[PDB]
Amino acid sequence: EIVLTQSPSTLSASVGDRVTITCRASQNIYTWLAWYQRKPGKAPKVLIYKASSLESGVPSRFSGSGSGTEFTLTISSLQPDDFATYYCQQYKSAWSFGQGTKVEIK
Amino acid sequence: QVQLVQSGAEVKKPGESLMISCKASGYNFRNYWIAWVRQMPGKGLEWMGIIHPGDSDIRYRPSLQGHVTISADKSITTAYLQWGSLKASDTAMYYCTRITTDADSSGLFHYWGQGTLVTVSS
Amino acid sequence: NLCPFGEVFNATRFASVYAWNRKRISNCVADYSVLYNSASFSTFKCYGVSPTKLNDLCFTNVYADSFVIRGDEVRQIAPGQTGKIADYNYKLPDDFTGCVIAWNSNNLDSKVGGNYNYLYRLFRKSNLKPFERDISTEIYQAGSTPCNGVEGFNCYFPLQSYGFQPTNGVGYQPYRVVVLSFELLHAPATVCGP
Ligand SMILES: *[C@@H]1O[C@H](CO)[C@@H](O)[C@H](O)[C@H]1NC(C)=O
């Protein structure tokens, strides 16, 4: 059983701003963290896998970094399509998701 | 392109029998794990079980070992989730995901179905 | 009678590679054809003796040693091959007569959340001479500073735990491996085919 935490739970900025999302792990997960984007009432879409690899078709603004137990999601420039909620799901031992972080306009 | 399509939402009485399906197309149904994920209201995403068609290998969580049943029909390429007897705590959003397998890992939930709300009430 | 291959292949418990289980089979009649024509085995590679030519040719006694490895590490169970498993855990001699039967056991030996029962040795100071096992778990010294037995800097735990899951890569599924080995001595041929 592995529990993950996201900080901050809620964070709002304007278009073009730099958004940093931190996912912290209970124990060591190496680099088996994947980042999802979920629109309200829609299936989540994978953005980053292996904690640093971009998925095909995702804009290059999203970036993944970190290893061990400290992970970071960085949005280079916020844009109207970036407004959604984000989950950091680990898959080292058994699939487990974070509580999620919701972003919106300011 | 991989497409997963599920059925519409159901509203059932407790104690009944419910079967919810998820149709998979765009890939070879016999060589990819498909997992069921449940998101109860007020709780985060949480898997229930996995099923690999071709080997007929079905594995559930320890807590839900004898309450839900996963099944597959490769002739039509659908994955079924059925309840022996619906309870009051089974109301949630149910997802079917095709696991993209990576080495030394539990696999990545890559493609998701549109989801299906299930509500239990009297 | 019949040679008891049932309790070595269909056994419910397989030992790890650092403690590979050895069974001496002798004084019975060999039925290797069932081994070859089962078609349920992923890999069945035989050196020295052809699979279709071992049915009649017979020996004095055979050793079946079984363990569980990774899927991508089954290429290392062969003479003159390197790697972690083939150097620190299980090394076959270049002049090898037995052969390797490895079949996938993803539905048995892998459990969701991590099956950490199976271990393999990762670090040791000397290579393995053919056909022996080392079980000693003393913390070896990586550097020149003595660790006095206790674990710490420049002294690591030799054993490492396999994490087996049903959703691992096809090259990382837990493969159950049995190795057959034959020897020639002055003893009469106890084990022979039909
Ligand atoms: C036991 O192992 C043999 C191979 O030696 C196999 O042919 C047989 O089917 C196994 N038993 C069962 C019940 O499958």
Q: Report d(CA C167, CA A24) in Å as an integer.
A: 24
Cα dihedral A91, B50, C12, C131 sign: negative
Q: Find the B54 Cα to ligand 1 centroid distance in Å.
A: 21
The experimental technique used to determine this model is: cryo-EM
- The CA distances from residue C94 to A80, C48, C53, C80, in Å, are 65, 11, 21, 6
**Helix, strand, coil abundance in chain C, percent, nearest 5:** 10, 25, 65
Of B106, B113, B114, Cβ closest to residue A94: B106
DSSP result, C89-157: I----SS--SEEEEEE-TTTS--TT-BTT-EEE---SSPPPSS----------SSSS--TTS-BTTB--
Superfamily of domain B3-112: Immunoglobulins (2.60.40.10)
Query: Nearest Cβ partner of A91 from B44, B45, B105?
Result: B105
Q: What is the CATH number of domain A4-100?
A: 2.60.40.10
- Partners of A94 on chain C (C-beta within 8 Å) are 112-114, 165
Q: Where are the domains of chain B?
A: 3-112
Give, for C84, the enclosing helix (H) or strand (E).
helix C84-84
> Taking a C-beta distance cutoff of 8 angstroms, is the pair C64, C180 a contact?
yes
End-to-end CA separation in angstroms for chain A: 37
Contact A93, B51 (CB under 8 A): no
Resolution (A): 3.5
Q: Kind and range of the H or E element at C9?
A: helix C6-9
Nearest chain C CA: its distance from A20 CA (Å): 30
The helix (H) or strand (E) run that includes residue C36 is helix C32-37
Residues of chain B with Cβ-Cβ distance to A96 below 8 Å are: 46
What residue segments make up the domains of chain A, in order of their start?
A: 4-100
